[PDB]
Symmetry: D2
Subunit: 455 residues, 4 copies
């Protein structure tokens, strides 16, 4: 049902298990914002799966073989051919992480005033699109915004919404389609191969380019192998390669599915766009031959991307997350369904039904979770959504969630039991969670540095 880890523990990381009362002052010191907690004070850190993964002995062997040359590093050539082989794109430009590649793509493929449409958004991805003069349009299926609706491939793009955008705005006013795999904001929800194929057929007929946000593409490929009909016999690698055959390029954060702690890259097939990308990367990231990464990190990322193609690795990765979700569901704890590839999202609206969204139930549930359990989680609700620029009012998302994000190969099922058991106990007296309000709020990107206080 739930497989054992398809690896052994090679080395362990020291942790501290501090008491509740000490956790209280830290939570107070952090303004009740888990983003402001210190790593050393956290038993199980589920803030994000980005850059928090455990590497393998093979990757660490590569770390000893860093060719740190400014140009022509063997590690770059290794990373280049690995991505060309596994993703199938013609050209690769390394970047220090995913948002470095997003900065490049948005400056290369967007004219001021054009539209960029995709299946929901991510913060840095949407920022670089809008800062380069684009207007974002969400074309995900309406079901993806419904936390409790348990349907497969919730991250699919609504082809009808896409056709509507092309007819009303014109294909020439659409910069590109930004297709994310998986869809982080909807709970790590996958996109079917049929949806990727249908988007490619519709966009190619209008000459509209398609670029993937591929940070969690391997988790996406597992869902296709598990649940999409006709792919149960295909390997993860074959599925990944076919996924990108429907794209003109991609932005990749190795910090997710490449099983590394730093790194990303930009891929594309177009020769002219690749030329302009190499001109722009030297300004922000570095040389086209290292792009803001040490040689050893290009090596670790090349090895890690190949490791992620092992079926047993990715099956266990996803099913460990599912185990935490299943234990929570069995105790009646409200969660986003179905469980995504990288995290379980607690539905703070149902968890904190005594609070309104103006009282920030997700931010307060995350604070309560750490104090009561020593687990750090991330607010993914009204605080992260920001304020509408025209009216200065809160954006009001249907998804008011607390994200329990699982780094790859770091924790065990017993750690998941600690998390689930603590949340299930907290759910018993959920009425005790107090509301929050801003005591400090920045002008932009308030989720990371804002401070709150109770009631």
């Amino acid at each position: 049902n739930y497989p054992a880890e398809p690896f052994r523990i090679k080395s362990v990381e020291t942790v501290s298990m501090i008491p509740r009362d000490e956790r209280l002052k830290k939570m107070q010191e952090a303004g009740y914002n888990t983003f402001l907690l210190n790593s050393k004070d956290i038993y199980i850190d589920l803030l994000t799966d980005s850059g928090t993964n455990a590497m393998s002995d093979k990757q660490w062997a590569g770390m000893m073989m860093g060719d740190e040359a400014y140009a022509g590093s063997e590690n770059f050539y290794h990373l280049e051919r690995t991505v060309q082989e596994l993703f199938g794109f013609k050209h690769i430009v390394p970047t220090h992480q995913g948002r470095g590649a997003e900065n490049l793509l948005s400056q290369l493929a967007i004219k001021p005033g054009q539209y960029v449409a995709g299946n929901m958004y991510f913060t840095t991805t949407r920022y670089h699109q809008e800062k380069n003069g684009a207007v974002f349009v969400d074309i995900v299926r309406d079901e993806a915004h419904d936390a409790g609706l348990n349907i497969a491939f919730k991250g699919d793009i609504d082809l009808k919404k896409l056709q509507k955008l092309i007819d009303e705005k014109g294909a020439e006013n659409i910069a590109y389609i930004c297709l994310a795999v998986t869809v982080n904001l909807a709970g790590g929800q996958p996109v079917s191969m049929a949806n990727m194929r249908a988007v490619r057929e519709l966009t190619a007929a209008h000459g509209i380019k398609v670029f993937y946000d591929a940070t969690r593409c391997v988790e996406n490929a597992y869902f296709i192998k598990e649940q999409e009909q006709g792919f149960e016999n295909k390997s993860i690698a074959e599925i990944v390669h076919e996924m990108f055959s429907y794209a003109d390029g991609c932005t990749m954060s190795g910090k997710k599915d490449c099983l590394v702690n730093i790194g990303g890259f930009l891929c594309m097939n177009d020769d002219e766009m690749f030329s302009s990308a190499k001109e722009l990367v030297v300004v922000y990231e570095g040389m086209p031959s290292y792009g803001g990464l040490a040689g050893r990190d290009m090596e670790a990322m090349a090895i890690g991307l190949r490791e992620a193609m092992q079926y047993e690795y990715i099956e266990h990765r996803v099913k460990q997350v599912r185990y935490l979700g299943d234990k929570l569901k069995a105790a009646g704890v409200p969660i986003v369904e179905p469980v995504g590839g990288h995290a379980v999202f607690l539905d703070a609206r149902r968890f904190c039904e005594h609070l309104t969204q103006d009282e920030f139930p997700a931010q307060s549930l995350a604070a309560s979770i750490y104090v009561e359990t020593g687990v750090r989680s991330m607010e993914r609700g009204i605080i992260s959504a920001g304020r509408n620029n025209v009216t200065g009012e809160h954006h009001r998302p249907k998804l008011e969630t607390v994200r329990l994000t699982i780094p790859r190969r770091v924790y065990t099922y017993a750690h998941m039991d600690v998390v689930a058991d603590g949340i299930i106990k907290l759910y018993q007296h959920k009425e005790d969670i107090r509301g929050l309000k801003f005591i400090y709020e920045p002008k932009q990107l308030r989720a990371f540095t804002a401070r709150f206080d109770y009631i």
Copy 2:
């Protein structure tokens, strides 16, 4: 009941998950002898807890700080202060592993014709004693020889047998008392502090020296804290320090409870014996300042010994083994009781009651365990007992067992579930396990290179 790992995974070790049919071919290639399997073909390797432990990030940081000098290495001084602080002995001599220290002690403290008495024996320990002209005398309590008897501190020395040996032979004819903690041969059974204090009081009255075999002393200290009355307020470190206060010295295999992959040492308080030890260590191991160890390994062992004192680490270590034993016992699988600190012993005589001991049931059970699960275990029965050279007959031990030995910090509860589930499944059709016979048998130490075939 069973605690989560008090650490997270820093790095993982690649394994191959070959299916049953391939595991069968590997087992046939190995002549149905788990000792002849290749490490690369094994999912979960429970052959031994010696030298197989996962190190911490701190230990690996120390590995980068190796002072490789031939004399006066900083790593040796670090190791020296740590052992003097934690064990309380005056003098420390490093050795490449435990049997290196036993070679030194046996040559220093034994006159040809003297007696060495202890709570059972280990193979290498008793060999160095007998090769230097000593006759071994078992003075363990009679209960230790009852595999099914579930009683505490089974490893205690019978004080009456000790008093009997002193009266019959004289104190001048007794080289030393060899007190092992824990007792490996009885299943990893602990020794109480009260027994250690009584042995020290009786030997000191007759001027008899006492030297500990302390390879699993930390596991022993946990049993004292858990089960001996009056020690529930003492730290692991306090218990360890008090244990060795009743000894004149010790031999240690760091490859066990020091959480390293290589290393050991010899301790003593006597100045003159320490002087002779420094002369003898240069012949067999190396300088008194490295003793057959790289500098980085003295550092890793010094750091690891201090890590082993953390209560949460050793509690989880012992309870992970107990978890495997409890799950097997709950399904009716016959095991040695009580479960020891480092391993679970399957009673292969009861498990394969349809086979005679001449058909090697423990060897054949270990073979089936690997084929059905990818778990390697060790035969501890008639094969390891060897053949009598004078008569050419099997030595026939009362204990016909398969040893599931758990390396420290390498596996999870899910891995223990893989082991237990496979063994329980085999137990439900145990009548199908076929006997084995020699197709190749060496003249000595047949457990390591013999090959078999089914009957």
Copy 3:
């Protein structure tokens, strides 16, 4: 005269020692462009001192202690305290490398239309200034533009030019003064403490902010200790701390004087500007607590910055470069004088006086240097100067040089002898060096991908 290395070799890097005939074929495969050579084909790689340094055993111990948390990593706090202690600034924001910090500073401290003045410029630094709407003004002393003039502290700012800029434009139209230490473009020339104090006094009277480009600040501090009167009793650390006391902030490329292969940061004292920096860093680099760096790399940079303060390290570093310059000068090889802190610049115009600048003498000298020695050097002449886009004409710099850039702690004096001996041998038959012409030329940044053939 020239000190031995104040360290020993802990580990070595494998190189290939291919003979001249193979090096020729590699050079032809690279189109006679050293930027297109593969690292694996190079014996001594003097392309740059950026990111190519050898780390210490202590830094590598830190690499094993990476706290990879997304927020609140212990490595960030270690880096934070180190910079606050050594540089004296209030606030620190990590970036993946120096140009990442320049991107942040240029967006924070520049209004469109303002002026930025400094002691010459660097490519990435001036680009971020000009892309945010600033006009660059060179206020370096006129002597800095005289390649052959051997005078001290060639990088000082001409206070009269600064006073002239303030009077003509007004202090409100000056974004900040950008003082680089050292000055890379002039050959790595230092700035005196007296010049730093005078700039601070003049700018503070007009309310003009001063930000340092401190990538090679430690090399600069050594020159002050060696050659500025009244500092021979001050430690390197004391000099560094006093240098930054005359600045409101800095951008740093740890890839230079922090003895690492990746990393940088942004410093400032203003609280409000630090708040805006934390909002902007999440868009381009990452969280204020890691800023596009792995935790292990923040640790390595924190350790490396403290190591750079050791007098013996930086003395040997600078004198190793000086050794190469002295040996070349003693044989009559024309070089830029005085020798800078990090590189020796060959005067290719004088070296290949039989060739015109349209025949690319610096590019061709670099080619011959690799073929004859296996040493890679960088063209810093007409090719790197680029082509004017409006007229399609070569930009023609007065400096037509080949840069021998020395990574820190990577090479020995014997390696410098290989470099010098080969160049001196080439100089004895310099008339044989043939000119080059484009067989391929990209539209921009031609230095990195252009290919040539002999004339």
Copy 4:
């Protein structure tokens, strides 16, 4: 003339350069015995080339790939095939270092009362021979004991002395011939291929086995390629393979020419002796599949042995030692000639002509060298020779030397200049070196723990 290092520095080791007065008290604390100095107090540690080598990036990559299994480790298989390929022996048994293999060989191949003859001796090698009942006979050419005689292949066995031993004692009373390459005690002097071939032809005619002490066999192979006629076109590997084709086995210390910090092995071709060796290794070292070594160390040793076959590596290694010898010779400093492969031996008899051998000039010169220069060297004279057991009097060797032993890939020519310059200055007032006498002397192996005082 003297080649540059055929590698780059990947990582550096921190050193301390403490003043003379502090060095004095340490030398006093150590009883004027350099063996008792602390590593942390030494700038350049030339005590020994054993276990002090710098590893490569490839070796350190292997260190991350330790397969720590007790049996069937991939690292053992790597080491096994590498030795079989490069040395040509049938069977390999790993040991923790060379003297572990010597303990095994001496117990396997010696009957009490037999003779073991060889080209001089080493301490641990001769101890295991004599402790197993053999009488040592030196059959090296008489010239090898003359420090100043500069002849090639000084380590050759005198075939006439060998024939004399066979005629007087009988071939049945000769256990084996112990042929060392190189000969450490004579100054690291090589053995010609012709001498190895002649010894094999003479011993095989009498059925006498030949076993090599091969710790520095690669240095030996370089001398053959450099100076023996007909081998200047053969690779180092071909020479090494042919060397061992004249032996029945070997004892190897990886700590020398395998470029590692720990490790050794025993090789042989005989099946029956290999069987007995595997029985004996489990008692002293460990399993035949790891033999007292961590898996990662078997991996590093396998890689290092292959690296030592690179001509440029071993040429530079030997010529760096020769450079130190040439600088000393040019200043008139008396040394053993010719310079050996691994060390320069100062001739303390000529250096301290005002002292008799009873005043221990070599021990006192080593003390003076450290105090005046911060360089540690080893006494190789009357102190190491020991006392004659029959008369209780000093053994009086013709060679009274101070050994400046060079670890592989650790130091530069500039470090050699520091050593040479300091010794040359000390030679100017050599009359100031005071004699020493025992204030403490052990019964055996006095060189390592004895303490002395002046006059």
